[PDB]
Amino acid sequence: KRKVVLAEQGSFYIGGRTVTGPGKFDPSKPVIRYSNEGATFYINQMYVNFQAPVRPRGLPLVFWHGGGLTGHIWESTPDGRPGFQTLFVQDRHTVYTIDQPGRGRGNIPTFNGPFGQLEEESIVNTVTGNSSKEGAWVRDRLGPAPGQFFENSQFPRGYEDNYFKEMGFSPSISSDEIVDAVVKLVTHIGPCVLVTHAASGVLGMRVATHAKNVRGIVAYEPATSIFPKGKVPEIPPLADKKSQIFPPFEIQESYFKKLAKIPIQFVFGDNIPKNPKSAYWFLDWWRVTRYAHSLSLEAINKLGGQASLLDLPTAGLRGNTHFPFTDRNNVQVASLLSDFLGKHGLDQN
């Protein structure tokens, strides 16, 4: 089960643009100096890895990490078991994994000067934000509070250090430029399936409205909902009566209707409450966010779509976290993804 046979593997950079400092470069002057003089910088490019099996069947899969993550989460679980990259090469799909602009091997746009600043232009903000171990613990629903685990947890307990070390900050790159890089990738590889997670959920939906080569989407616990412009349904605030979920993204209806042309599945793990929970902000946040997504999928289906919501507990899988593809039962989670691909013929040539 750890063995993998690759016809080919590799990695490359795609997307991005260039920005430039003032003046001219002189090769006789000291080159190692604090200066943007005569400088050309490549910024906002994306890193892409691929592994291809011998005799691939069906469409390539593009795995797109969630917020603050990298392609590592598709490579291995925190306790060292095979990730979805290995599992789906074994399932005879070519597999692409990316580090989006601003994350991991993607570009972080900084120069000579305060972070993110190229002379007078602010490419990204100098002030950053970042989550904590404690924030990530409850965001990911390991348990209701740091140090605590829900009863039938599929988290790989004992490997907390490995898990939280994989997370980090994102600079303030425009979401337009992240979408642009993946649109370019989808043009490059041809017909494919996007497999997204959390923060890349809404970005993958946006990519699909720009790229007909996206033939299906599976999104693990997407973080932001998407609706036709001006048609966002009423969404309640959280139980604290003061907080709200992420403002839904709105796109013009002519683009939204492209989401009705491909199969789309949103997958949710366990321990999302049915009723308000004022004591546990992130549990309540997930309740209302999942509700918003159910309305988003309904709007897609009313336009002729093929969108569905899969709650892993309804499929017989209990205890999954916000990362079902690295949980202890990730092989069973992968089996459900294979089922989706097979149902729609995305595993056949």
Added chain:
Amino acid sequence: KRKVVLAEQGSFYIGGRTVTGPGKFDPSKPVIRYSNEGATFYINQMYVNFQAPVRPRGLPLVFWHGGGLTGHIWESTPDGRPGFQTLFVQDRHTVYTIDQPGRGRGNIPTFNGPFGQLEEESIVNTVTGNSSKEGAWVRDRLGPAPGQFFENSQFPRGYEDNYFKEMGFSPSISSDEIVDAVVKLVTHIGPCVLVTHAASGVLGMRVATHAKNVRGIVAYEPATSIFPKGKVPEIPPLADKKSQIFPPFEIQESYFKKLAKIPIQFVFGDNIPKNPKSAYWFLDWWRVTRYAHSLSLEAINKLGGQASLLDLPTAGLRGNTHFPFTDRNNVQVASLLSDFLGKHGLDQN
């Protein structure tokens, strides 16, 4: 020949520490906020990838990228040919590739606040530095000035954008903490060989003085020379009679002596001038830096060592850049690395 059979592959995080923000975490309060309140942050951890062949022979190889780079440079060349990772898995070595702390999938230590600042504490500097395309062009000796190639160049022309997109800034993480992470990796792996490049040259030498598991070093064009404390020889300034090379790193003789106990090879490419070249700063810089390394290797041999300098043109290979392992003749470069491993018994069990 692109096919690769892996007994196993994966990745993991290792090394690093934690820093903590003020106060306590309350799961009832909004978790997504501009605050380090109650926050634990994992910082300065390293990303590690591994690919193991069936029936490995000899010691595992740890490939360590140069300055501003990532493990991508061992995966593929800019024009998409197999990198040393593939070539040496095919050569029946287990291959580790790393993204060191502060680069790629390694941690970049920043929080909520100005880049690198945790409340009143500066973990890394807010002001960054970075090379340009122009500076990298002449540092890497593609040619004497940006956009110009040496006639004999082994660079994969036409893939310049791909090449420069792989480079980025590094935050001011202490070199001690980078060495510490690799020492911990070497402890985990067991006996191994370090293959370093440019900025990681001096760091790999330091790791070997702390880790008897390092059984050999091959360094491609190391950037900083190393000497016993108080025994730095006379090194001239550059031809401009103003600039100097990087100040040599000095270590205790009792640690320096450990470098005499393992085989060490420094590898240099082509187009490094023999005589002073005041018109081309980085060509002259490489002349004096290579000279300093010659004296460093001499110092190791006078302690009973086996340290050698391989100039690729003397082996019949002409035109190599600062990245010989991604140049057009990188298969021939790899053959010379296999020759070194075989002479010293590092390719047998």
